[PDB]
Amino acid sequence: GASALSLSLLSISRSGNTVTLIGDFPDEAAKAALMTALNGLLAPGVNVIDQIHVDPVVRSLDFSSAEPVFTASVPIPDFGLKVERDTVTLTGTAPSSEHKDAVKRAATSTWPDMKIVNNIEVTGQAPPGPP
């Protein structure tokens, strides 16, 4: 029925020690494309907590090209990724600046028909943000 024009909300948190990413995926093989990305952050003694449900029907974020993107965010284990049902937001602690540029460019290419709002905020001047 022309399927739905809405993507399942997703949540991904990366701090370093442990990783927290929950949501729903369309297939299982899809994990291999993303997982192959973790191989970059995978450290000795590192814990992983990712629970995704399979749903060959529910429209989800196409990470097929998340490697190039996620890989662009690898040098930052303190980054966050959020996808909505109409838009996608990007926010991560960047003690630098332009360092976020490459990250945004990578996402834009991956999700051009979706609104991307990448608003980095350097934790320094202002007080500690939300938990």
Q: Give the CATH number for residue 110.
A: 3.40.1520.20
Are the C-beta atoms of 87 and 113 separated by less than 8 Å?
no
Q: Which residues of 3-39 are buried (b: 16+ CB within 10 A; e: fewer)?
A: eeeebbebebebeeeebebebebbeeebeeebeebbe
Question: Sign of the C-alpha dihedral, residues 39, 40, 45, 47?
Answer: negative
Structure tokens at 127: 């007080």
Residue position matching structure tokens 């600046």: 97
Could you tell me if residue 47 is inside a domain? Answer: yes
Q: Report the distance separating Cα 43 and Cα 33, nearest Å.
A: 18
Task: Kindly give the pairing relationship between strand 47-54 and strand 18-25.
Answer: parallel
Method used to determine the 3D structure: NMR
DSSP H helical ranges for the chain = 29-38, 66-72, 99-110
DSSP 44: T
- Domain residues for the domain of 64 are 10-119
Q: Report the distance separating Cα 22 and Cα 120, nearest Å.
A: 22
C-alpha dist (Å) from residue 116 to 38, 49, 125, 129: 23, 26, 25, 21
Could you tell me if residue 95 is inside a domain? Answer: yes
Give the phi and the psi of residue 73 in degrees, each rounded to 5: -105, 5
